[model samples]
Target: MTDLKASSLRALKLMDLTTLNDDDTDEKVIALCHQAKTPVGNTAAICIYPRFIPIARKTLKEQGTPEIRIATVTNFPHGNDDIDIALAETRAAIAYGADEVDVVFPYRALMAGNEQVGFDLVKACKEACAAANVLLKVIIETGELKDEALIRKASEISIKAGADFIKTSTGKVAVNATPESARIMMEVIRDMGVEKTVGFKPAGGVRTAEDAQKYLAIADELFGADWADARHYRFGASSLLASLLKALGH
Candidate 1:
């Protein structure tokens, strides 16, 4: 619907590669991304834990997969980690050559009526990345949020904090990224007219080309031409690349 070709379609559906806390899993994922090359042309960046950034960077180097960015997750599956620690983690991840930083919003704080704290944490992390040139993707973990209003608020706060993108779910718990959730999230960005810079990423449980296509259709219906490239509209999927190849008549 958005004039998506196989290359661009594959780019939109990413491999989360989360929980890469161990070398074995890390190496295994690396081989997977490499072998699945045809299905995932110019593979979308690999999302991993901040602690494993070095491992991934080194592994990618050995595999010769250039253009596969190292995306480090800060505050991880949960944003309960202290704000200061998160910022330091962001700085460190960038120093370790992470091309992007994915930080989760403090859902507990936000649910407890401390929106400022959640916003502040993202702001600080974004500020830390300003000089580092590493892009920041803020995960709202929408599944934990009880309503569309909260999801809207999260998107606003993320944008206000200078996030390059607002994401849905961390794939840790609850429902993964959904078209309904994505519609709500993107609408907020659209209503606020924050389209020129910020982006939208729907992660978790997206496992097929049809799933990717559904998300893309929503993006096209909402963001239209602005939803261009993997940078603007992204799917944080770990195993959807192969399915997309089959759907594309590859």
Candidate 2:
């Protein structure tokens, strides 16, 4: 065996324990907060819809895992091009006590050739997050863009607009988070050099220990084994958590 035990432990540390479904309830979200810390270690953060930040925030404090970031989505899986609406949502999310805001990039406009719209939305949200001392994740919705050229451009736009992390997919799309897209985004983050440290998160459809390892394997190719961790790398996945636990003997 290749010994997945070590990498599975890394998956536990890097995984974002998420619950973004419409049916998500207060009790369910609270339940998730309690699971943030496990026998092996802690998942890096808890990702949920914008309305649940306070619930997640308070729950984590009570659960004693406040170090796990409380992340919510703005403009959400829609990738709204309305800068004002996204900006408003960003500020409100922060006010609700979010530690991180994952804003959907205005990718539809980009696909229509309106690159500036994406830049404007991500930049505005990044500024909002910066002011609040919160991290900003730009979800490029790579699957929707559908090819290498668009994917590369979206990654560049998110990075240029000051995304602390460039995330793939919203966990809503049919083709969420593929290694191909992960590779493109990772390459962009890598080429940016050391001027700034940008993180990479491949969300959605990533559910198994093997799936989690797929992306990190690419990072090892360009970033080396120790370069990726909780600080600079994350898997915006919740299902992968159970699998990691199993591999960790939990």
Candidate 3:
């Protein structure tokens, strides 16, 4: 097996420490910012609701952890087909100091053969992110898509639409991130070539050092070890940080 301690520490730097609960409070967001920098290391970013981006930014700045990025979600959970609302949310998040925005792809519309609706939504949000100089990650919700073909199509569409990262799930569905879905997405990314390269984030239920390493292995296998860094890959997780610390012997 690969060195668990070393791999866990690398995974730490690639984590987007997430907290998207309906009850997430300012206090919780503050605590989460503090937790982003563990004894082992600091996570790459913190993913939270759009309203909490300012709080997370302020708290992280106060803590002097400005290196970590702030990521917020838009058109979240349901993959709502409202392009205007999604773009407005994207712009608002960027204005609030979000370094990255994860928007849900209109998976339902796409699955229903309305590809133009989904594609246009992602493109508009991508443009919003571009105008604001922020990274955009499109969540395809592969668990709900539930097939290799659809997963690959979603990955292609997201890449063509200018996504900086193509995420696996929102962690709000019956099935969350899985190796199968990740492999399909990574394969698409691998074939898309570096000029059009897109990052991959496996969110939802990825809460263990072993789980983190599994995703890392998939990235490494598909794109080589050099490609599996904070820039090209991330684990959208909340509880995984503690597990990574434990594995790193902290």
* Alpha carbon deviation, residue 93, candidate 2 (Å): 0.5
Candidate 3 per-residue C-alpha lDDT over 1-250 given as tens digits, one digit per residue, 9 for 90 to 100: 2478878988999999999998999999999999997876689999999899887888898888999999989998889899898888888888888899999999998888877877889899999888888999999999899988889898888888889999999999988899989898888887888424588999999989999889888887776788877778899998889998888778
The parts of candidate 3 lying over 4 Å away from their true place are none
- Against the true structure, what is each candidate's TM-score? 0.88, 0.96, 0.97
Q: Tens-digit lDDT track for model 1 on 1-250?
A: 3344643454544544444434546566566446434543555677766656677777767767767777878888788838998888888888888899999899878877888988899999999888888899999988999588889898898899899999998887878798899999889888989888888888988887777777777777877744646677666866676666656666
lDDT of each: 0.76, 0.87, 0.89
lDDT per residue (tens digit) for residues 79-124 in model 2: 9899999999999999998888999998899999999999988999
Clash numbers, per candidate? 0, 0, 0
Distance (Å) between predicted and true CA of 132, model 3?
A: 1.3
| Residue pairs with backbone overlap in model 3 | none
Ordered list by TM-score, greatest first: 3, 2, 1
